[PDB]
Amino acid sequence: EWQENKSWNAHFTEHKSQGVVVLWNENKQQGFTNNLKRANQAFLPASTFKIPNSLIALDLGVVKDEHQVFKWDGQTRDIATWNRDHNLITAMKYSVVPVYQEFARQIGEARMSKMLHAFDYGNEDISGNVDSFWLDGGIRISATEQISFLRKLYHNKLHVSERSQRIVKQAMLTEANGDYIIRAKTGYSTRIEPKIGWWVGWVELDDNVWFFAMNMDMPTSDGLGLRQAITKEVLKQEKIIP
Numbered sequence: 001e002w003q004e005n006k007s008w009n010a011h012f013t014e015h016k017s018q019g020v021v022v023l024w025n026e027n028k029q030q031g032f033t034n035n036l037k038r039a040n041q042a043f044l045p046a047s048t049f050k051i052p053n054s055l056i057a058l059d060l061g062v063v064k065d066e067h068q069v070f071k072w073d074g075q076t077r078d079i080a081t082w083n084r085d086h087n088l089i090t091a092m093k094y095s096v097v098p099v100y101q102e103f104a105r106q107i108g109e110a111r112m113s114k115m116l117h118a119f120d121y122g123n124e125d126i127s128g129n130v131d132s133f134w135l136d137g138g139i140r141i142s143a144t145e146q147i148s149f150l151r152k153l154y155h156n157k158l159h160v161s162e163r164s165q166r167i168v169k170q171a172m173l174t175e176a177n178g179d180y181i182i183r184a185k186t187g188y189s190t191r192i193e194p195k196i197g198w199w200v201g202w203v204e205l206d207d208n209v210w211f212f213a214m215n216m217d218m219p220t221s222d223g224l225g226l227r228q229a230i231t232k233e234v235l236k237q238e239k240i241i242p
C-alpha cells in the first residue's frame, strides 16, 4: 500500500526547493512519500545510472573486479577528483563520468539495451549516444521505479550473477556506524530540464531495511548537499535513524 504524507513538504520548502522523497519499509511492504505524483514522474537518472552500468560492466567482464584500475586518460577535466586513476569503488564515490562512459562504449548498445530490459529499469530506452544517454538521451526513471530496481539488487534478484550484485552493493557503501548502514548513489541531471538532484539507496538496520529514492529541483550546484540532508531529515523525523 502507499501513504502520502504532505507534512514532509516542509523539509523541501524550508530550503526554498521542491522535490519528492519515497520510502519503502521492507518488513511491512509499505511505501511512503510526500508527493505521489512526482514519485511517479520520470527523470533522467544521470549518475544514479552508475548502479546498473556497474552491474552490466561486471557481469560482462568489462570490469574484472573492484580493484581493476581505470587509468586517467590524461584529459584535464573541471572535477579535480576525475583527473586521476580510479577503481570501481572510487569511480562510484566521485561519480566519475568518463570512466563510466568508457564502460558503456565497451558494453555496446545491444547488450546495454538487453540488460536494462532484463532489469526492468525505467523506460528501458537507451536512445541517444551510447556513452551519454543517461545524461542527455531518452532513458527515464521515476523515484518509485528506482525503489523497485534497488529492492531487486538488495535481494540479489537482478539477472546478473550474485557476485556482480555483491560487488556493486559494496561500491554503493556511503555511510556506516553503530546504528545504520547506507548504500546509495547520488545523481545530478543538468542537460535537460528540469535540472534535478537524485539520492537513491537504502538504510540497513539490525532488523529491517528502508529503501529510499529522492529527487529535487537543482537550479545550481549550490544545493547539492540538500539531497542527503533532506533525506536524512525525513529519516530522522520517521525515527528510522537517530
Ligand SMILES: Nc1ccc(-c2cccc(C(=O)O)c2)cc1
Pocket: 047, 079, 094, 095, 186, 187, 188, 221, 224
Ligand atoms: N558543476 C558541477 C558541480 C558538481 C558536480 C558533481 C561532481 C561529482 C559528483 C556530483 C554529485 O552527483 O554529487 C556532482 C558536477 C558539476
